[PDB]
Symmetry: D2
């Protein structure tokens, strides 16, 4: 239990908290912090980027309520034409499709707002302003919400370019969850190549990039030359 | 409200009760009645057929308990690796497959016992004994449980020969549910032909047989020259 | 279907929407509107009252998430010591008490913030500022959230002074839900007097005030000299 | 792991299986065994006692289906008048009371049949016939179902005379669950005395009898001079 290992355990928990599924307490904390950063930044394009990012998260939060209400309404129905096991299976499959289609619509609306937030941050041309902690914090939040919205619906290939942009920001590369999700997203791509009998150069590329992020995630949370890091190094070597 | 129409409404309800999903009260009533009929019949092959039929229904009843217990056990688990919507969908799909596989195993065991019940009734060669009400009652119960087990798992083509044997017994042809299930089973076959671009002679045969049973089911529960019977006749004509 | 009757049906729906249980879409709409009114008002005490009101609603919204998460955690447990019906009853009664105690704690925190919002509005002494639409809108929202928090936990007597202050604001007296909840709250008090064999002057007072608000709620949504209004007048007369 | 300790672990599991909540597989096994014992016994009073015992268990089994169907029907209703937390609490409390009242009715009908089973066994006067394994097996099954029906509804004092009659039969005194339930039932009585400030002679009697059965249950499943038996002896000493 070194000063650095205690700092590690606390930091991994703080990083896991950062990547937590959105809820009310987290929404309130995020937007209270972002609105103060907007006041300190006093930049019109940042204000417009924040407004779009907030609308995008609001789309997600509204959809979370829609799904609970829809499931409640479906549970409260009497099913007179459900004598057979296959009928109840079919009905649950139709309900799951309605939920999936509404979540896809909410994700599309949310990504349109995130894309607009990015368009406003692209308008901040001054390199000194782009290096500001306020700028990097909002950019990280937009990308993280974007990655999570795609990941939730199993759009793992779509998360890869966003996660790669995210890890380039400040010290985001030291984030164990960013590496864990990147590793899984590359794994999905490797598996898609193996399943579709795709080209070997792509298989090896995806396998390599999965291993890079799997090794980095292990190193970050367990440390270099620990039983977890040494083990992953041995299988790859 | 004629003497015959009052007799019709009461009879359709009694027929719907006959085709009800198996529960404890129905099981107890069925086997108490069958065991008394076995005593009156005093025939060793009937006794052995009844024992196999009972074992087959017992398989079904035991499986009903297994499914409720399995669903209860699955609901009582903490899911630490279920952050994403697609993960919960996948997990529910795995649970539904375990349920489907166990129901298929119970159906196979139940049909093996029903087949053995039929083998023992086939050993009763004396034509006077085969015409006995006890014989026809057990034969109807075996076929009805067999049809229902297949129908529950969406094995509608498999129900067709069994339903056709069932309706030949005594006055079973006057049963609205037997015609309703036959009509749906022929409809499934017609739809399979249309979906697989099968031969026209089969399409027309299945369409015709669906219409025969749809018309008969309507005639039986609503009566000839009623607004329901006249309507179905017009669409077919 | 007169111009006024069409205006009535639309208005009752808008009033029912105003008194709807809090959800994310409603929270977002309320605080986006209140924050713009704060900008137009440009008053420091209004800003502080709005901040306290928002913290109070946030307490309620956070508690809604806490309850769903608690119920989920309780459902996901295996109960090895629950062989008997009375054990499952007792366990559900303990879960309901934990929920009730947490909701009472959240209500107490929310009412402390609403009380602080009212303290800041009490600091706005200028009679011209107290007559502003921004002032009356925030005051109505604070009282309505306060009434609803108390009503949710069955604190109906506590809602009476708040509902009476609420109906005095602008045209809030024309609100069918305000009269409906007042009528029920007075009914609870009348029933408490009858149950505790309380004094007749209190029984008659509560009965009268229940009737006043029951009659007003009927008049507002069905109109004067309609089959609903005429009926209530006849029973009271 | 001695020959006796392996015999102990297997036997405690067989005893726990004997006291398991009734389900279809257990019902089928019990009545198939009892009907064969009836054939070997060839006694008319035993046949009538078995018929009453079966009707009593059937009452219980039918009620298990009734409760699941009632809960299903209640879950499938839309509740338009359930805006408030207290309304949903009240509604669930009304549902629990309907379930409790139906279970009490089924228990009363089941105990009337068990009492009739006992009346028929009381008619078997020949001491040689009363010592028969068939007689003792049916008597144990009647008492065990009777105890369990009472225990399920928290009628623990009512179970005490039945458990005391049960443990007198053959080697039923070697049954760990019989002692465990007796200990809990005496504990309930001790707690009722402490709660109602009842007489000390009753408190000490119930405390003593609770300890007798708690010590015996420990001795039976863990063995004499084991860490579990030695411990319970020390607290009592």
């Amino acid at each position: 239990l070194t000063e650095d290992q205690k700092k590690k355990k606390k930091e991994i928990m703080e990083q896991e908290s950062l990547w937590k599924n959105p809820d009310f307490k987290g929404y309130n904390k995020t937007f209270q912090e972002l609105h103060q950063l907007s006041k300190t930044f006093a930049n019109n394009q940042f204000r417009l980027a924040l407004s779009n990012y907030q609308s995008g998260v609001n789309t997600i939060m509204k959809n979370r309520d829609w799904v609970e209400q829809y499931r409640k309404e479906e549970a409260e129905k009497k099913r007179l034409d459900e004598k057979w096991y296959w009928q109840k299976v079919d009905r649950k499959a139709r309900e799951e499709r309605v939920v999936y289609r509404e979540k896809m619509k909410a994700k599309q609306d949310a990504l349109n707002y995130f894309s607009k937030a990015i368009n406003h941050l692209d308008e901040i041309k001054n390199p000194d302003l782009r290096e500001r902690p306020e700028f990097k914090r909002l950019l990280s939040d937009v990308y993280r919400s974007w990655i999570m919205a795609e990941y939730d619906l199993q759009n793992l290939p779509q998360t890869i370019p966003i996660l790669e942009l995210y890890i380039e920001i400040d010290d985001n590369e030291k984030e164990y969850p960013a590496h864990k999700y990147l590793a899984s997203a590359y794994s999905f791509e490797e598996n898609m190549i193996k399943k579709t009998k795709g080209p070997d150069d792509m298989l090896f590329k995806y396998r390599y990039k999965k291993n890079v992020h799997l090794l980095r995630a292990t190193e970050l949370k367990y440390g270099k030359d620990s039983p977890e890091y040494k083990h992953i190094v041995n299988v790859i070597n």
